[PDB]
A paper describes a structure:
Here, we describe the expression of the recombinant HblL1 component and the elucidation of its structure to 1.36 Å. The electron density map showed continuous density for residues 41 to 404 (accession EEM59260.1) of the protein sequence. The overall fold comprises two almost parallel helical domains. Domain 1 is a bundle of five helices covering residues G41 to Q210 and R315 to K404. Domain 2 is a pair of two-helix bundles with an interleaving two strand β-sheet, covering the middle stretch of the sequence from residues A211 to D314. The points where the chain transitions between the two domains (residues 209–212 and 313–316) show some of the highest b factor scores in the structure and may represent hinge regions through which the two domains could move apart, although in the present structure they are in a closed conformation. Domain 2 in the head region also features the only beta hairpin in the structure, which is a typical feature of this class of protein, forming a hydrophobic beta tongue that has been shown in HlyE to undergo extensive structural rearrangement to contribute to the pore. In HblL1, however, this hydrophobic region is more extensive than in the other Hbl proteins, is rich in glycine and alanine residues and contains a central proline (Pro268) residue. No super structure or macro cluster of HblL1 is likely to exist in solution as a biological entity. In the computed complex, the beta tongue region of HblL1 is buried against the tail region of HblB; the β-tongue of HblB does not play a part in the dimer interaction.
The Hbl toxin is a three-component haemolytic complex produced by Bacillus cereus sensu lato strains and implicated as a cause of diarrhoea in B. cereus food poisoning. The toxin is composed of three components HblB, HblL1 and HblL2, all of which are essential for activity with no individual or pair wise activity. A crystal structure of the HblB component was published in 2008 and all components are predicted to share a similar fold, characteristic of the alpha pore-forming toxins (α‑PFTs), also related to the Nhe toxins of B. cereus (another 3-part toxin), the HlyE toxin from Escherichia coli and the App6 pesticidal protein from B. thuringiensis (known as Cry6 prior to a recent nomenclature revision). Although it has been reported that all components are able to bind to erythrocytes independently, more recent work strongly suggests that only the HblB component is able to bind and, thereby, to carry out a rate limiting priming step to allow lysis by the L components.
Author numbering: 42 to 406
The structure:
Amino acid sequence: GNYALGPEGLKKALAETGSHILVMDLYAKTMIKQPNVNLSNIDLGSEGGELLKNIHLNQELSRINANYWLDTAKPQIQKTARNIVNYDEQFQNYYDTLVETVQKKDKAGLKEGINDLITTINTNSKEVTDVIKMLQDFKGKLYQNSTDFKNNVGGPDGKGGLTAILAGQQATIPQLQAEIEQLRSTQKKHFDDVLAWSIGGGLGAAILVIAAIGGAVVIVVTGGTATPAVVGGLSALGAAGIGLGTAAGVTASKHMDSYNEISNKIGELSMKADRANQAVLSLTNAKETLAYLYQTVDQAILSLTNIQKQWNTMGANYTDLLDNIDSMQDHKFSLIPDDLKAAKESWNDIHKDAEFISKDIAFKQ
């Protein structure tokens, strides 16, 4: 067209943002359900007793950070999506007036309408900057809690901390720690592969997958270790028209089943372990999740930075129209409705999916 008045790359950025919200919700809920590590009636010496006291303080702060995600940080990301919905409602409500001002050759009227939309675009861009600052602050708190916990569990380098005291008592502990770390990194890759398939299908498909997974998540606590699983995997998507039965859908289903397979295995390791080995499992599990949490907020910051870039690009595109209207000859002026109509359709197309991202994913209560 002559003027690009549509949502630009907002669809792709929303799909990524929705995927990060799901992952943060899972990790936060898992952290909240994991209890303080039980090493009662195990002689750890004074060194180990101090490390255990510090670990319990770290675990209490992990649960505070998880609740901050759920109650404070997430709603600010959801407002970013609500602002997309509200821009569509403003655009749809201005549309007939903007078309009328073209038909009446009313340049002042059209310019005032476009200026009002620019005002909203600029407000939306400024609001994302504030959300990114809030997330950067939160990332700093997640990184501090992660590194404090890692140091109390394993020292700076994995050669120390409470795990080395327990490994001094039981020679099988290092192999157990390594097994958990491997299972958790394999499992995260499987979940990332499911998310890759859901994003690859477009925002519409992404929202159906997010709803199906969120609605099916259960958190199981075994031997003091909390582990998520997705009941029935991707089963609920079989009639969703997103290609679950395609080769790529079958691969995504297999990854979800492998994710659940690893949750089962971690529970099995915990069931068979004594108290000390259960502590190695639970602390190692938590260590991995606390690092994944700050990594996922970093990803969320990147996706909101992209949303900010899209609002800024859109503000430039509308300002180009605004600046050109006064000198524009009648023929080009009469074509502006092509750009309005194209934008009407693209904005309406993003509304329901933005609305979804603006509201909690429905997990079990």
